[PDB]
């Protein structure tokens, strides 16, 4: 089974939250009709070079559904410092700022 | 928004290969699906395959074996390449652009016949 | 794969009658089919997209209906210039594929 990329636009459902682990687990509602389709999900300390830092702990995540505007959960496992959670592709992709510590 | 351009050889000798492009402006094509497509005055419309850049593909799979893409960044150009060219695929080819976020093909180039003759 | 059946093949109707195109696949895949508008000599236009929703610069006398495996093109008051083929579109998802119906050919009475 071979999954095409989420194309549409994503939003922050809730303020993402941190767990008790030091990860961060976010839930987004996304726009899009062409589910079933693999999210776009990273972690990012260059928004130039959008070169993966950190680990997605979520295996793969996918929008299983073409049901418009539903809602997935994911978790990321940020690096130390600063970084981004940043979430879809395009002009529409959302951010968020992030620090982790220990 | 978007527009799309085809240009390609009008006439291609019997099991040689077909090159196609296209040319986009208005948009990037780093980003998103775009895709080609062909039709037949014969057998109505025929979806080829796309390519997300630096992503993945996906082909037709009655065609997969005989078709490449190519992809040009710094030009906003990709292509289309098909082997062993028939009688079969004479055709008016089209690129055109996967609607972000949906299940359809929102802009498309005004197409390109394609005629295979000795 | 999927395949759709539209019907009827031809549609001869006079302006101001209301047109009613119909589009039936084979087993239902999602709610949100797509219309695409061919004029001669021209590449398809997106008509409408996800069943219902309009595309830009789509009039409103078009619209779309339908759900699960049976959708439908409704143009409520014909006019001359829409004169065309009319086809729905659907996207497979495994294999992952666009498939196409064979058209209905809308002729205007006069």
């Known amino acids: 089974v071979s999954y095409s990329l989420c194309t549409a636009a994503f939003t922050f459902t809730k303020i993402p939250a941190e767990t008790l682990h030091g990860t961060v687990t976010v839930e987004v509602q996304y726009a899009g009709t062409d589910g079933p389709c693999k999210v776009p999900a990273q972690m990012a300390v260059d928004m130039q070079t959008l070169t993966p830092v950190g680990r997605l702990i979520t295996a793969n995540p996918v929008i299983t559904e073409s049901t418009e505007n539903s809602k997935m959960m994911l978790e990321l496992d940020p690096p130390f410092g600063d970084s981004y959670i940043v979430i879809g592709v395009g002009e529409k992709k959302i951010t968020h700022h992030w620090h982790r510590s220990g | 928004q978007v527009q799309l351009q085809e240009s390609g050889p009008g006439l291609v000798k019997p099991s040689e290969t077909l090159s196609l492009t296209c040319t986009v402006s208005?948009?990037?094509?780093?980003?998103?699906?775009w895709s080609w497509i062909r039709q037949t005055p014969g057998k109505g419309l025929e979806w080829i395959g796309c390519?997300?850049?630096?992503?993945?593909?996906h082909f037709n799979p009655s065609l997969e074996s005989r078709v490449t893409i190519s992809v040009d960044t710094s030009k906003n150009q990709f292509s289309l390449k098909m082997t062993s060219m028939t009688a079969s695929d004479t055709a008016v080819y089209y690129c055109?652009?996967?609607?972000?976020?949906?299940?359809?093909?929102?802009?498309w180039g005004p197409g390109t016949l394609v005629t295979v003759s000795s | 794969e999927i395949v759709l059946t539209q019907s009827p093949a031809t549609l001869s109707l006079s302006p101001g009658q209301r047109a009613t195109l119909s589009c039936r696949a084979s087993?239902?895949?999602?709610?949100?089919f797509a219309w695409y508008q061919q004029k001669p000599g021209q590449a398809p236009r997106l008509l409408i997209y996800?069943?219902?929703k309009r595309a830009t610069g789509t009039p409103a006398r078009f619209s779309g209906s339908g759900s699960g495996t049976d959708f439908t093109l409704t143009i409520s008051s014909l006019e001359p210039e829409d004169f065309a083929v009319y086809y729905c579109?659907?996207?497979?998802?495994?294999?992952?594929?666009?498939?196409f119906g064979l058209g209905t050919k809308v002729e205007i009475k006069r």
């Open positions: 579109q659907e996207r497979n998802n495994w294999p992952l594929t666009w498939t």
């Open positions: 390519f997300y850049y630096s992503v993945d593909n």
């Open positions: 996800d069943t219902s």
């Open positions: 208005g948009g990037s094509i780093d980003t998103y699906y």
């Open positions: 087993q239902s895949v999602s709610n949100y």
């Open positions: 055109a652009r996967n609607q972000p976020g949906g299940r359809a093909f929102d802009y």
